[PDB]
Structures are given as structure tokens and as C-alpha cells.
Amino acid sequence: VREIVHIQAGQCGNQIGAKFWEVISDEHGIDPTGSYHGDSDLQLERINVYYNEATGGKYVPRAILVDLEPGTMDSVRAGQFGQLFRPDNFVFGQSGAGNNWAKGYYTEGQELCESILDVIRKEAESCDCLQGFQLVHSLGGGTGAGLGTLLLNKLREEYPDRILSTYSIVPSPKVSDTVVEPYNCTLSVHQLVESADEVFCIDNEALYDICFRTLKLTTPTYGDLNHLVSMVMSGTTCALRFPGQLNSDLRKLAVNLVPFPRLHFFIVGFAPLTSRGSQQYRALTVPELTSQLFDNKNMMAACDPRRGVYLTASAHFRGRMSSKEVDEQMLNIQARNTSYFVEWIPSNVKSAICDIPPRGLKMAATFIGNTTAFRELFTRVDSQFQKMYARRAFIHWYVNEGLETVEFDEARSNMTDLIQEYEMYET
Amino acid sequence: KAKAKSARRPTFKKAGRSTRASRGHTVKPAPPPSEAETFKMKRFKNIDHYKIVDYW
Amino acid sequence: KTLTRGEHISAESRVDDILKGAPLTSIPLENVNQVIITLKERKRQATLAGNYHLSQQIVDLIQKINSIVIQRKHAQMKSQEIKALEIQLQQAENSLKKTIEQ
Amino acid sequence: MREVISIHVGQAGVQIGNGCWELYCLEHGIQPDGQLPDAFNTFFSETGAGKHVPRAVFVDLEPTVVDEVRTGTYRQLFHPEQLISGKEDAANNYARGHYTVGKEIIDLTLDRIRKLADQCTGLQGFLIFHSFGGGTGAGFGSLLLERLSVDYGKKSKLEFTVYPSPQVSTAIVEPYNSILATHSMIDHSDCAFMVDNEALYDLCRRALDIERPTYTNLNRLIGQVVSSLTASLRFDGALNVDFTEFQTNLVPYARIHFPICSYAPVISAEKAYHEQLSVAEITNSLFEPANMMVKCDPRHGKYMACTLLYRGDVVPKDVSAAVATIKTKRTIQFVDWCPTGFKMGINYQPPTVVPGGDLAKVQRAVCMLANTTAIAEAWSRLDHKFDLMYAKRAFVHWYVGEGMEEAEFPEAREDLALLEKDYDEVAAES
Amino acid sequence: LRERERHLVLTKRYDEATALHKEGNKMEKIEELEKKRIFLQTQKRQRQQLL
Ligand SMILES: Nc1nc2c(ncn2[C@@H]2O[C@H](COP(=O)(O)OP(=O)(O)OP(=O)(O)O)[C@@H](O)[C@H]2O)c(=O)[nH]1
Ligand SMILES: Nc1nc2c(ncn2[C@@H]2O[C@H](COP(=O)(O)OP(=O)(O)O)[C@@H](O)[C@H]2O)c(=O)[nH]1
Ligand SMILES: [Mg+2]
């Protein structure tokens, strides 16, 4: 009874969210039509977190799907789980996305804002309690970055106390799908720094790299790339849904990992990952899990921690396992690499254990950490934005919507200060 | 160099130290009661005597 | 905490006046630390003699002075907003008519 | 007759509850449903027919841990109103669990403890379990002890808490809550016990033979110590020890009360057949640093008082010989202003075994509770760790936003320094 | 009463601490008078007993 409301924004959020609902529906044994056909009484203990109950034993997820063009939504309907969602939670416009941040924020976002908010109010005030909301969007696009940030501000004004956890995809440095990305990423960062409590950054390059290195997938499509992201989302809320030896929900994570209000951008990683042919030759144990998690290659964000230093880190474990063995590893990885931790905070590594593992896996672990290595990510976008901003004519696409040019200077200034702030704590 | 010292004040770029999210989370103490809750009209509020004979 | 005698004399004289309840704005902002710290000693002295009633009164004075000081700080914040934005707005006000002139 | 009331706070407290009450029910012989297939009335109440109910209250601010008891096997034994669960946990925040959420549920618990006290003709004390690092364990536990201090006054409020491990940690904010909780404990607690997880892991692997433990195995070790502690109130013995005798003999000063705990023999069911385990042998095992449940070396400091409890075929003559010998060694230092230093308690009931347990069917055992200046080693570590994080103001924003004024941070720091001064002043000699 | 009054003062609950101090002094006066009487009764007896 710590209900969480799910929000999916844009072409990226809908396709990530759609795969995400397949994972939990399998975890809790929910049939695609919405009826429970499971195998254990444990799965019905606290299923209220994500699903609502209708007459006749049907469960409806606490989800809202948001887009500006109907093309993405009709793909969700045709899916095997299309009939699962409540039809009134499908909110769409009738205009092109435009792939523009200002147009999504100001022109079409205002019209969709009131319609979306009242739908959220139906879900928000339908449950006995509400821990926080959950948002999935991309930062290189126009709807997820433009409209998503607008909804993030309105959610904060009405529900200040609740945890606004967001999962975001950061534009890639080498090759990316869009030209105007540097404007979209910079302007959205202004809104994300002050509004959201927690932000997780994921880069598509690492998901490609991890799949080629580890899973040995020759041609991974977005289906398997999204699957890695859905495990991280499932792992963080696992303490809410299942019992365990030591429980740790979202608000515990925010307290431990966030030392200062603005430094809350996080990196994520998941273990164990093994090639689907090599699983027989690998004795998966507790020391083996930590070997992957603290290995830099398993980061889903292309920001090598070794070039920076850690501030705080947290690990979630699932499955019946030794509490001594979990604690002993956390000692050693902190002690063996003392050159990569801040001296003025001892015991930088948080731990927690949950009883029930995901299907097929006897035990698994999840990593969330905060480090100065984010400076590499923001340097690339700021330098590219600087190159683009002097060529003022691309701004003309944003001026024709109502965006003042000073907003560019404001957006870069706060982004520049965050880079300095993440640098200043290295002393 | 004195200008350099004046530029970097001893705060050392601890920007935005109270963010919008933290201002949402902080607990706000109770305010004074609303006027309607206090309301009783004057003459009855001013009454002095009673019908119970507690004297001798 | 070994507050100096010069601060103690000035603060306690106002502390004596504050304990009469009449002063509302007589607080010196730079000397507010001395007044509160002086009340701490008077709080400790009151407790030692069973005068818990005066101890709570000193507590009420502590919150009264602090709360009103915040309101004096609150007026400072809004004065900053009007003054700063008016100068920024003047840049746009001048440009509007000059755009017509050009 | 003579009675105690058990109060459990937090995830550690409730999980310890299952560990201890499983032992009490099995040792007394009551089935999980409350029937039978004596000292019964110290821990259980009778309702007529043949039904018994524990004299305890379980408290937490999140429903997951409690509902495992409510759905578990032992669900019928406990009475529904005793199990109290909040809405959202303290999120490892002292201020949250003390001012905002703590005060949302504090007054509901105070009725159930007082109502449970009406069935107490001869109440002589409470037992309270914490985990210092947690939010509710420190925040709500501090608020609970402050109220019980004025509600009942001169009634022994014993505590049995888990001190933070010297290096092993599960929460980064652990130093903040441990120091803040200490100020509330010292003035109001009659006596508070410390154990730490890191020492138990080493003891549960070396002496007891387990490669990898869980929290369940640790809870049973604590269950044995508490059972020995209360055995004097329940069963016949040549030398009983009431709660009040325990309070006066151990604490030399008002604020120095903090003891440390040890148990012997702890030995696997396989190797236990190999030794006779005389009174002298088991007594010598307690005094080694390796058997200590708190990872502070007694040799760094001095001993202030000691108490030994014996549960088995233990004769008074051979107790005196063993305690005489340990006095002759010069590795156990004593402050020379405490020449006697001991209270001995003897009970006849041998330790009880548990199915699926880790210990053996031992015919004599000894429990030890002593106050040492070596615990000042533990306070120094916590004080230094808090200083580094507070110097750069690493987490203050979370606590201040939840109702706590910043002035409490130096007040708690100053009060701990005074306690450190007290321990060093006690260690002085004349 | 004076043990519970200590914690009321120490918890910074001063309004309720005033009430117990009022009852504490009242309960002293009744008890102070009694032991004065008993001592005077015993003191008077001893000189009679010795005489
Ligand atoms: N020895 C032992 N320690 C435990 C056990 N369970 C929890 N702990 C300790 O408890 C600490 C974490 O605090 P919690 O267990 O959550 O206790 P709490 O007071 O309820 O804290 P909140 O859940 O935030 O309200 C861990 O660091 C453990 O050391 C247990 O079963 N045995
Ligand atoms: N990880 C992942 N990324 C996707 C998926 N579909 C699209 N994307 C990426 O999301 C980025 C932004 O998509 P876009 O159509 O602009 O979404 P918008 O926010 O609604 O504008 C593009 O660079 C796509 O490559 C998916 O299924 N998974
Ligand atoms: Mg708890």
C-alpha cells in the first residue's frame, strides 16, 4: 500500500514502458487480458502498488501514456497487452511531434497539459496512499523532453512531498538519431535539476556495447535493448513488492545517495549478465555478482567512473543469500579501491536484500551510484551546444514558437554551474 | 589577485543550495487559524451573566 | 558560552524590556544572538528555582523574536524581487518604442 | 506474580521477536496456537480455557515486516491489537521518525502498553529492542522512551540494542542517527545493552561452525542471552538475580551504564561431544576477546563490574574457584577502586535447544555482562566519522526539512563529548 | 512524583511540570508535620521513661 503511478512520455517512453509492463505482469503472473493465473500466494500480497482491481478479478495498471502524435499509441494497442490498459488513460494530440523542444513545451504542451493532469488526478486520488510518481522519457526528442518537463513541474506544484523518480535517455556522443539534440538536452536539464528528486541516465551506446560484449547478441533490436532497462526499473521497486531480510524503498535510496539537493544524477547497472550459451560454465555466486556490478563495462551510461570519483553508491540484492557474504564484499570493494572514494564520507556503499528473485535467476543484483564522472557527459553536450549556439539560425526554429533567446543563456549557465558544482566537491 | 579573491567568495560555487524539490519536502509549521473558525457575533460573545444560581 | 560582558549588558537590558512584553521591534538584528543567549542563562536560572512558568515564557520569547525576525527577512526577499526585475524590465521597455522608430 | 513487558521496535526488533518468542514458547512448551499438548505467567497471560497470549508489543512504521508475523505460523498466538504498523517508514531519517511520522502513531502505542500493564499485578520492568542505525529504531524509539519515562517513572527500562559495527555498515546516514539517539537514551534509560553484527558474524563462523549465516542465525544467539538473563525470574536456583539487583551492581555512575555481553560455551553440535566443558573451562572462554559480542578489546581498557549467570549442573564451590583464578591473571585489568567486581547468579534449568538450530545440547552454560572502559574505543570511532561528514554538511538538508532544528546537531555532538569525558574520568586512578 | 517531575522538566514540558510541583510541596507539608509529631511524641516519652 505504497502505490506508484506510472507515466510514459514519447516514442521512447511508450516502447520502454510497454516492455516494462510485460516484465512485471510476468513477475506477478498477470495474464495479458488482466486475470491472475499465477503460482504462489506471495504474488498477491501487495500487488496494489501497480495494479487496480475491477469487478471480476481484472487488474488494470496505474499507467498513463502520453504522446503528441497517434502513431506510437496504435502500436501499443496492437500489442498483446494492448487491451490491458484502461482506454481513458490513452491521451494523445493530433499534431506532429516536430522534434522541437520549444514547440512541445509551449505550443502543443499547454493544450495537452490540463487533459493529462486530470487523468493523473484520477489515478493519484484513487488509492489509499501514494509514495511517488514514475516518469519515462527521452531527452533527445521533442515530446518526451518538451512536454515531459512541463508535466514534471505541474506534478511538483500539486504534490511536493511525493518522490518524482524519472528514467531518462541521454543523447549519444558519437552517432545519434537527431541533429537538434544539443538544444533539447540543454533546455531540459534546467527543468530536471530543480524539479525531480531522482534522475537515472541511460545511454544507448552502452546498451549496444554491453550486448555485443556480454550477451553476444549479433543483431540486438530495441526489444532486447529495452529489456535491460526494464530490469533496472523492476529492481528498484522490488523492496516495495516483496518481503526481505532488509527492506529499502525509494525514499531510503534518496536519503542515502543524495548528499546535496542538486547532485542527484545517477548511473545504473545490472548483474549477472552472461552470454546465453556461456551460462553453463559460470558458477554464479555472491562474489561473482559484485565483480560485474563494480566493473566499469556494465554501466548503462557511457561515463567511465575511473576518470572521476564516487560520492555514494547503493546495491540491491534479490534472492536467498548470506547477509555476511553481501556485507563482506561491500567492505572489500570499498577497501580495495580506496583511490576512487571520497575520504570525507565513510561507508559510501549502501546495501539491501530482498527475498524473491526474478524468474529464471537464482540471484541477481542492481547498482545505483553517484559520481563526478557525469562531467564527461555534460562536457560533450555543452561543447556541442556552444558550437551550435553561435550559429544562431537554428534558434529561429525555436523563436517562431515563442522562446526567448535569453532562455538559451539561462539554460547553459545553470548547466555550466552544475558542471562546476560536481567538480568543486572533488576537493 | 585581489580582484580574483573577490570574484571567488568563500561559498565556492555551492549553487542552488535550497532547490525547488527540497523546498517541497520541508515541513511547514501550523499557520494561525482562519477567521471563520473564530466567528461569533458581538452581543452574544459579550454576554456576562447566566441562569444558574450558584450563589447563596 | 562565555559571551563578553559588553554584549551581556546591552542584551540583558533589552532582555529585561522584552520580558515586560511591550517591545515588538526593539530587536537589534546584529545583537539578536546576544539577546537569545542571555535568555538561555535566564532560562537556566529559572529552572533551578522551580520557576518553570518563567522558563516557558522565555521559550515563548525565543520563538517570538525568531519568528518576527523571519518576517523582517521576508520583507527583504520581496524588496529584492521588485528592485531587480524593474531594472531588467526597463531594458525591454526602451527597446519596444525604439523598434517602432527603427 | 513477577513480570516483565517486552517492547520491540523496527525491523531488527520484530525479527528478534520471532527469534526470542520461538525460544520462550518451545522452552515453556506452549504450542504456536496457545495450547499445551509454572513460570508461564512471567511472559504469558491466561484467558481462561487453555489459551495463552504473549505480553509484548511489536511496533514498526511499515507493514511488510509485521505482516510476516501476521501471516506466519505463529499468527494465532499473538493478539491483533499488539501488532502495530504504520504507513510509510522513516527512510533512515531520525527527524522523520521522531517528529513527523513518529508522532502520528506514538499515542496509539502508549494505550496498548498501558492497557497491557493493567494485567500486571507485579510489573518490575520493561525490555526494549532497537537498531541504532535505523530511522524508526532511533527516531520513534527515542520518542517512546521519553514518554514512558514520565508515564511510569521509577520502573526499570532495560534496553538491548545493536550498536553499529566498527566498519560494517548498511546505511550511510548511520552516524547521524546513532549520535542523535544516544542523547535521548542516556538520561532516560536505566541500562542499555550493546551488541554488534560484525562480532556475531565472526563468532557464528569460528566458534559455531557455519560458513555463511543469515540474520536468522544471529537472532537465535541473542535469544539465548535474553533467556538466560530472565531465567532467574522464572525458575528455581541457588542464587537468583532480580532485575533490580542487576541495575545496582553493574552501573558505577549515572551515565556509565553501558555494558557488553558474552556467552559461553558456543560450540557446534558436532564438536560439543568432544569436551567435558567444566565450569572452569567455560568461564575462561568468556574472557577472551574473540568471544565478545562487541568488537572492542577489553585489554585496551579496564573492567568496572561483572556479572555471571550459570544455567546447568553448576555447583557454588567450583564457581568461586574459577572466578578466583581469573582474578589472579594479569590480562584482566580492574580499576583498583573496585576490589570485588562480581555478582554471581545460579539457575538450574539447562539451556534449551531449537529445531533447525545451530547450537548443541549443552548441560552447563554461562552468560556474562560487564561494564568496561574499552567501550570508549567504540564511541571514538563514531565521533570521528560524524565529524568528517558534518564538517562539509553532508546530509543536513534531509533532517532539517523533517522538523528538526539544526541546533540539535552540535548539542548531540557536545553531549557525546561529555560522555567520552566521563569514561576517561572513570578510568582515572587515585 | 519528583522522579516524574524530573523527566517533565527534562523533556521541555513545563506547563505540566508546574502541576506536579504544586502537589509535591503539598504532599511534603502533610508528611513533614507527621514526623515532627512522632519525634516529639518519642522525645517526650524518653525523658518520662528515663525519669
Ligand atoms: N542483528 C540484527 N540486525 C538487524 C536485523 N534486522 C535489521 N538489523 C539492523 O537494522 C539496520 C537497518 O535498520 P532497520 O532494520 O530498517 O530498523 P528500523 O529502525 O525499522 O529502520 P526503518 O526500517 O527505516 O524504520 C541494519 O543495519 C541492521 O544492522 C536482524 O535481524 N538482526
Ligand atoms: N532505448 C530505446 N530507445 C528508443 C526506442 N525507440 C526510440 N528510441 C530512441 O529515442 C530517441 C528519441 O525518440 P523520439 O521519437 O524523438 O521520442 P520523443 O521524446 O517522443 O520525441 C531516438 O533517438 C530513438 O533512437 C526504444 O524502443 N528503446
Ligand atoms: Mg522500520
PDB file of C-alpha atoms in Angstrom, chain A residues 216-386:
ATOM      1  CA  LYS A 216      26.871 -11.974 -27.526  1.00  0.00           C
ATOM      2  CA  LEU A 217      23.787 -10.811 -29.440  1.00  0.00           C
ATOM      3  CA  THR A 218      24.842 -10.305 -33.057  1.00  0.00           C
ATOM      4  CA  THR A 219      21.832  -8.165 -34.078  1.00  0.00           C
ATOM      5  CA  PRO A 220      20.031  -6.849 -30.976  1.00  0.00           C
ATOM      6  CA  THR A 221      16.927  -4.821 -31.757  1.00  0.00           C
ATOM      7  CA  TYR A 222      15.231  -2.385 -29.390  1.00  0.00           C
ATOM      8  CA  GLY A 223      13.363  -5.321 -27.844  1.00  0.00           C
ATOM      9  CA  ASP A 224      16.448  -6.683 -26.097  1.00  0.00           C
ATOM     10  CA  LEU A 225      17.874  -3.200 -25.516  1.00  0.00           C
ATOM     11  CA  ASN A 226      14.678  -2.198 -23.711  1.00  0.00           C
ATOM     12  CA  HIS A 227      14.735  -5.448 -21.721  1.00  0.00           C
ATOM     13  CA  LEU A 228      17.922  -4.404 -19.919  1.00  0.00           C
ATOM     14  CA  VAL A 229      16.318  -1.108 -18.895  1.00  0.00           C
ATOM     15  CA  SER A 230      13.174  -2.811 -17.580  1.00  0.00           C
ATOM     16  CA  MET A 231      15.187  -4.972 -15.166  1.00  0.00           C
ATOM     17  CA  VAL A 232      16.646  -1.860 -13.515  1.00  0.00           C
ATOM     18  CA  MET A 233      13.174  -0.345 -13.126  1.00  0.00           C
ATOM     19  CA  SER A 234      11.876  -3.604 -11.649  1.00  0.00           C
ATOM     20  CA  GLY A 235      14.805  -3.951  -9.250  1.00  0.00           C
ATOM     21  CA  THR A 236      14.454  -0.549  -7.600  1.00  0.00           C
ATOM     22  CA  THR A 237      10.811  -1.075  -6.577  1.00  0.00           C
ATOM     23  CA  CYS A 238      11.356  -4.707  -5.564  1.00  0.00           C
ATOM     24  CA  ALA A 239      11.596  -3.848  -1.861  1.00  0.00           C
ATOM     25  CA  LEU A 240       8.073  -2.412  -2.039  1.00  0.00           C
ATOM     26  CA  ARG A 241       6.546  -5.515  -3.605  1.00  0.00           C
ATOM     27  CA  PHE A 242       8.301  -8.404  -1.881  1.00  0.00           C
ATOM     28  CA  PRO A 243       9.417  -9.115   1.697  1.00  0.00           C
ATOM     29  CA  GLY A 244      13.059  -9.418   2.583  1.00  0.00           C
ATOM     30  CA  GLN A 245      15.747  -9.548   5.228  1.00  0.00           C
ATOM     31  CA  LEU A 246      16.430  -5.800   4.969  1.00  0.00           C
ATOM     32  CA  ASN A 247      13.934  -3.557   3.184  1.00  0.00           C
ATOM     33  CA  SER A 248      14.906  -0.371   1.327  1.00  0.00           C
ATOM     34  CA  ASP A 249      12.382   1.511  -0.824  1.00  0.00           C
ATOM     35  CA  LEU A 250      12.798   4.674  -2.920  1.00  0.00           C
ATOM     36  CA  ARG A 251      12.835   7.210  -0.093  1.00  0.00           C
ATOM     37  CA  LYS A 252      15.615   5.326   1.685  1.00  0.00           C
ATOM     38  CA  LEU A 253      17.606   5.443  -1.557  1.00  0.00           C
ATOM     39  CA  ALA A 254      17.153   9.206  -1.937  1.00  0.00           C
ATOM     40  CA  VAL A 255      18.282   9.917   1.631  1.00  0.00           C
ATOM     41  CA  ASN A 256      21.488   7.882   1.415  1.00  0.00           C
ATOM     42  CA  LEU A 257      22.614   8.661  -2.137  1.00  0.00           C
ATOM     43  CA  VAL A 258      21.768  12.384  -2.270  1.00  0.00           C
ATOM     44  CA  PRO A 259      24.117  14.431  -0.061  1.00  0.00           C
ATOM     45  CA  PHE A 260      23.139  17.759  -1.589  1.00  0.00           C
ATOM     46  CA  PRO A 261      19.915  18.840  -3.295  1.00  0.00           C
ATOM     47  CA  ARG A 262      21.285  19.314  -6.819  1.00  0.00           C
ATOM     48  CA  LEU A 263      23.702  16.352  -7.047  1.00  0.00           C
ATOM     49  CA  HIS A 264      21.265  13.523  -7.725  1.00  0.00           C
ATOM     50  CA  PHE A 265      22.087  12.308 -11.252  1.00  0.00           C
ATOM     51  CA  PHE A 266      22.807   8.586 -11.059  1.00  0.00           C
ATOM     52  CA  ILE A 267      24.340   5.774 -13.085  1.00  0.00           C
ATOM     53  CA  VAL A 268      22.813   2.291 -13.172  1.00  0.00           C
ATOM     54  CA  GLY A 269      23.995  -1.247 -13.836  1.00  0.00           C
ATOM     55  CA  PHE A 270      22.630  -4.772 -13.603  1.00  0.00           C
ATOM     56  CA  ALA A 271      24.181  -8.167 -12.837  1.00  0.00           C
ATOM     57  CA  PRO A 272      24.538 -11.024 -13.615  1.00  0.00           C
ATOM     58  CA  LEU A 273      24.799 -10.738 -17.404  1.00  0.00           C
ATOM     59  CA  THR A 274      26.165 -13.708 -19.336  1.00  0.00           C
ATOM     60  CA  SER A 275      26.106 -14.905 -22.933  1.00  0.00           C
ATOM     61  CA  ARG A 276      23.135 -17.210 -23.368  1.00  0.00           C
ATOM     62  CA  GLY A 277      25.498 -20.015 -24.436  1.00  0.00           C
ATOM     63  CA  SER A 278      28.133 -19.494 -21.742  1.00  0.00           C
ATOM     64  CA  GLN A 279      25.780 -19.724 -18.741  1.00  0.00           C
ATOM     65  CA  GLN A 280      26.769 -23.340 -18.028  1.00  0.00           C
ATOM     66  CA  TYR A 281      30.456 -22.541 -17.434  1.00  0.00           C
ATOM     67  CA  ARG A 282      29.888 -19.797 -14.842  1.00  0.00           C
ATOM     68  CA  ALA A 283      29.442 -20.521 -11.125  1.00  0.00           C
ATOM     69  CA  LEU A 284      27.194 -17.589 -10.227  1.00  0.00           C
ATOM     70  CA  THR A 285      27.795 -16.642  -6.577  1.00  0.00           C
ATOM     71  CA  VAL A 286      27.817 -13.524  -4.406  1.00  0.00           C
ATOM     72  CA  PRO A 287      31.457 -12.536  -5.163  1.00  0.00           C
ATOM     73  CA  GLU A 288      30.764 -13.027  -8.870  1.00  0.00           C
ATOM     74  CA  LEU A 289      27.829 -10.583  -8.787  1.00  0.00           C
ATOM     75  CA  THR A 290      29.860  -7.753  -7.269  1.00  0.00           C
ATOM     76  CA  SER A 291      32.569  -8.421  -9.859  1.00  0.00           C
ATOM     77  CA  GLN A 292      30.170  -7.405 -12.634  1.00  0.00           C
ATOM     78  CA  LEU A 293      28.475  -4.521 -10.809  1.00  0.00           C
ATOM     79  CA  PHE A 294      31.656  -2.612  -9.993  1.00  0.00           C
ATOM     80  CA  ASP A 295      33.157  -3.468 -13.378  1.00  0.00           C
ATOM     81  CA  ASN A 296      33.026  -0.267 -15.422  1.00  0.00           C
ATOM     82  CA  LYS A 297      31.812  -2.096 -18.544  1.00  0.00           C
ATOM     83  CA  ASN A 298      28.404  -2.875 -17.011  1.00  0.00           C
ATOM     84  CA  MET A 299      27.463   0.804 -16.623  1.00  0.00           C
ATOM     85  CA  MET A 300      24.478   1.608 -18.826  1.00  0.00           C
ATOM     86  CA  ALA A 301      25.745   5.208 -19.082  1.00  0.00           C
ATOM     87  CA  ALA A 302      28.880   5.935 -21.127  1.00  0.00           C
ATOM     88  CA  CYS A 303      30.712   7.758 -18.326  1.00  0.00           C
ATOM     89  CA  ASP A 304      33.746   5.800 -17.096  1.00  0.00           C
ATOM     90  CA  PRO A 305      33.793   6.127 -13.283  1.00  0.00           C
ATOM     91  CA  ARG A 306      37.578   5.675 -13.122  1.00  0.00           C
ATOM     92  CA  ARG A 307      38.062   9.154 -14.586  1.00  0.00           C
ATOM     93  CA  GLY A 308      36.017  10.526 -11.680  1.00  0.00           C
ATOM     94  CA  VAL A 309      35.377   9.617  -8.038  1.00  0.00           C
ATOM     95  CA  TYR A 310      32.397   8.103  -6.251  1.00  0.00           C
ATOM     96  CA  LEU A 311      30.309  10.026  -3.743  1.00  0.00           C
ATOM     97  CA  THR A 312      27.694   7.409  -2.801  1.00  0.00           C
ATOM     98  CA  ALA A 313      26.731   4.013  -4.176  1.00  0.00           C
ATOM     99  CA  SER A 314      23.922   1.579  -3.442  1.00  0.00           C
ATOM    100  CA  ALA A 315      23.382  -2.096  -4.232  1.00  0.00           C
ATOM    101  CA  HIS A 316      20.173  -4.138  -4.234  1.00  0.00           C
ATOM    102  CA  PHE A 317      20.285  -7.925  -3.941  1.00  0.00           C
ATOM    103  CA  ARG A 318      17.469 -10.359  -4.716  1.00  0.00           C
ATOM    104  CA  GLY A 319      17.303 -13.975  -3.612  1.00  0.00           C
ATOM    105  CA  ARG A 320      18.073 -16.165  -0.619  1.00  0.00           C
ATOM    106  CA  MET A 321      21.671 -15.338   0.227  1.00  0.00           C
ATOM    107  CA  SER A 322      24.110 -14.822   3.077  1.00  0.00           C
ATOM    108  CA  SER A 323      23.985 -11.442   4.786  1.00  0.00           C
ATOM    109  CA  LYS A 324      27.601 -11.936   5.861  1.00  0.00           C
ATOM    110  CA  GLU A 325      28.749 -12.542   2.288  1.00  0.00           C
ATOM    111  CA  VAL A 326      26.928  -9.457   0.994  1.00  0.00           C
ATOM    112  CA  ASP A 327      28.382  -7.275   3.754  1.00  0.00           C
ATOM    113  CA  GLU A 328      31.905  -8.672   3.353  1.00  0.00           C
ATOM    114  CA  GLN A 329      32.024  -7.785  -0.351  1.00  0.00           C
ATOM    115  CA  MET A 330      30.869  -4.243   0.386  1.00  0.00           C
ATOM    116  CA  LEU A 331      33.813  -3.939   2.785  1.00  0.00           C
ATOM    117  CA  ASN A 332      36.367  -5.154   0.258  1.00  0.00           C
ATOM    118  CA  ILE A 333      35.275  -3.219  -2.832  1.00  0.00           C
ATOM    119  CA  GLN A 334      35.398  -0.077  -0.693  1.00  0.00           C
ATOM    120  CA  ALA A 335      38.776  -1.044   0.778  1.00  0.00           C
ATOM    121  CA  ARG A 336      40.499  -2.421  -2.333  1.00  0.00           C
ATOM    122  CA  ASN A 337      39.881   0.712  -4.451  1.00  0.00           C
ATOM    123  CA  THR A 338      40.147   3.493  -1.874  1.00  0.00           C
ATOM    124  CA  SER A 339      41.550   5.781  -4.592  1.00  0.00           C
ATOM    125  CA  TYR A 340      38.027   6.013  -6.072  1.00  0.00           C
ATOM    126  CA  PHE A 341      36.028   7.110  -2.999  1.00  0.00           C
ATOM    127  CA  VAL A 342      35.745  10.413  -1.150  1.00  0.00           C
ATOM    128  CA  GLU A 343      37.544  10.464   2.188  1.00  0.00           C
ATOM    129  CA  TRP A 344      35.110  12.874   3.867  1.00  0.00           C
ATOM    130  CA  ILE A 345      32.233  10.373   3.694  1.00  0.00           C
ATOM    131  CA  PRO A 346      32.932   6.940   5.219  1.00  0.00           C
ATOM    132  CA  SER A 347      30.830   3.876   4.409  1.00  0.00           C
ATOM    133  CA  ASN A 348      29.974   5.129   0.930  1.00  0.00           C
ATOM    134  CA  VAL A 349      28.261   1.874  -0.115  1.00  0.00           C
ATOM    135  CA  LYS A 350      24.653   1.080   0.792  1.00  0.00           C
ATOM    136  CA  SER A 351      23.203  -2.434   0.783  1.00  0.00           C
ATOM    137  CA  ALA A 352      19.821  -4.147   0.924  1.00  0.00           C
ATOM    138  CA  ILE A 353      18.444  -7.656   0.443  1.00  0.00           C
ATOM    139  CA  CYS A 354      15.142  -8.865  -0.989  1.00  0.00           C
ATOM    140  CA  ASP A 355      13.896 -12.421  -0.660  1.00  0.00           C
ATOM    141  CA  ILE A 356      12.387 -13.184  -4.065  1.00  0.00           C
ATOM    142  CA  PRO A 357      14.490 -13.226  -7.264  1.00  0.00           C
ATOM    143  CA  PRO A 358      13.268 -12.616 -10.820  1.00  0.00           C
ATOM    144  CA  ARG A 359      12.235 -15.609 -12.884  1.00  0.00           C
ATOM    145  CA  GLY A 360      14.936 -17.959 -14.121  1.00  0.00           C
ATOM    146  CA  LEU A 361      17.565 -16.302 -11.929  1.00  0.00           C
ATOM    147  CA  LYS A 362      18.504 -17.754  -8.552  1.00  0.00           C
ATOM    148  CA  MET A 363      20.048 -14.429  -7.501  1.00  0.00           C
ATOM    149  CA  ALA A 364      20.704 -11.033  -9.073  1.00  0.00           C
ATOM    150  CA  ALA A 365      21.807  -7.535  -8.116  1.00  0.00           C
ATOM    151  CA  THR A 366      21.311  -3.896  -9.132  1.00  0.00           C
ATOM    152  CA  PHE A 367      23.640  -0.905  -8.798  1.00  0.00           C
ATOM    153  CA  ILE A 368      22.865   2.802  -8.448  1.00  0.00           C
ATOM    154  CA  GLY A 369      25.692   5.263  -7.870  1.00  0.00           C
ATOM    155  CA  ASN A 370      26.514   8.959  -7.984  1.00  0.00           C
ATOM    156  CA  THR A 371      29.913  10.126  -9.206  1.00  0.00           C
ATOM    157  CA  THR A 372      31.745  13.133 -10.610  1.00  0.00           C
ATOM    158  CA  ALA A 373      32.179  11.167 -13.859  1.00  0.00           C
ATOM    159  CA  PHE A 374      28.957  12.829 -15.066  1.00  0.00           C
ATOM    160  CA  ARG A 375      31.156  15.806 -16.003  1.00  0.00           C
ATOM    161  CA  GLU A 376      32.167  13.904 -19.147  1.00  0.00           C
ATOM    162  CA  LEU A 377      28.543  13.643 -20.280  1.00  0.00           C
ATOM    163  CA  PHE A 378      27.747  17.321 -19.744  1.00  0.00           C
ATOM    164  CA  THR A 379      31.011  18.487 -21.316  1.00  0.00           C
ATOM    165  CA  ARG A 380      30.136  16.829 -24.633  1.00  0.00           C
ATOM    166  CA  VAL A 381      26.662  18.368 -24.876  1.00  0.00           C
ATOM    167  CA  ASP A 382      27.807  21.799 -23.664  1.00  0.00           C
ATOM    168  CA  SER A 383      30.661  21.951 -26.180  1.00  0.00           C
ATOM    169  CA  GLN A 384      28.347  20.855 -28.995  1.00  0.00           C
ATOM    170  CA  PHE A 385      25.691  23.314 -27.823  1.00  0.00           C
ATOM    171  CA  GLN A 386      28.312  26.084 -27.812  1.00  0.00           C
TER     172      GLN A 386
END
